[PDB]
Amino acid sequence: VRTLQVETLVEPPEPCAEPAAFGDTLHIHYTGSLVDGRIIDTSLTRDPLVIELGQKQVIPGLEQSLLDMCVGEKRRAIIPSHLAYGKRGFPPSVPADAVVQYDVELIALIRANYWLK
């Protein structure tokens, strides 16, 4: 896997009025795993992870996979090694040069409406 692969698992319930874009604050649930099935980390039993798109708070492939995501949508991203943890890996949980898979659900999206602020 040399390129980011993104698959839509669940379509959004209503037509996507506000697709995710850079700068938006996203609340997401995710499950990251290695290609062999070992779970790296999952947020499904926790509060949603809050990230701002463009701030490099998650691995590059995951941030790219969240672009244009819609509320209620679920995606699976297969992320090549150079867009995840690279040559260094993420010890003790992710070996070097590992391809990773993330299942993500967009729970809420807070771009603030300029009028609403």
Binding site: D47, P48, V50, R88, P91, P92
Partner: protein, 197 residues
């Protein structure tokens, strides 16, 4: 690694002495109710500081397995990430239940610490000295790394234990106590000549 980084290893261990000294100091406190209140401040202050520290390192783009953090802005962040996380391991091991309630719930906190733990594990800081096991132990405790068969948190005891339905030792305590009560009664009767029924 870098010679200054080697100096940092002495610096980090030096902080550990104060961190453990305080860790004992917190143990001296008795009330749990105060204990959680300060401990919660430990997590919020430490993790929020950690969030800034990771952002500082992210802007620096300095490899963990690399030359000693030199610029003071990143270098202090390196001190915060490694030193605070090491103290976080002590807090987690000493107070497993308290941290898990206030830490596991938040995904951001777990992810942020996970970045720090790998960041330390690539630097090699927890490879030498008496604090190198701390990185392995904390990851196992938090479930980031597989728990060893012999790895048991000494502090993680079940203080609730089980209802002391079996109290033969306490039954003996009851007997001896009532027995002393019985002995005094006889001694009272002794005195001298009493009246006769």
């Amino acid at each position: 690694l870098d010679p200054s980084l080697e100096i940092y290893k002495k610096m980090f261990e030096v902080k550990r002495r104060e961190q453990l000294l305080a860790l004992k100091n917190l143990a001296q406190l008795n009330d749990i109710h105060q204990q959680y209140k300060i401990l919660d401040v430990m997590l919020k202050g430490l993790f929020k500081v950690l969030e800034d520290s990771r952002t500082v390192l992210t802007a620096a783009d300095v490899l963990p397995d690399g030359p000693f953090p030199q610029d003071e802005k990143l270098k202090d962040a390196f001190s915060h990430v490694v030193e605070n996380t090491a103290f976080f391991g002590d807090v987690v091991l000493r107070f497993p239940r308290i941290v898990h309630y206030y830490f596991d719930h938040n995904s951001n906190w777990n992810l942020l610490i996970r970045w720090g733990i790998s960041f330390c594990n690539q630097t090699g800081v927890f490879n030498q000295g008496p604090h190198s096991p701390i990185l392995s132990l904390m990851a196992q405790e938090l479930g980031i790394s597989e728990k060893d068969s012999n790895f048991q948190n000494p502090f993680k005891i079940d203080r609730t234990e089980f209802i002391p339905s079996t109290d033969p030792f306490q039954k003996a305590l009851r007997e001896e106590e009532k027995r002393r009560k019985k002995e005094e009664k006889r001694k009272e009767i002794r005195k001298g000549p009493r009246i006769s029924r």
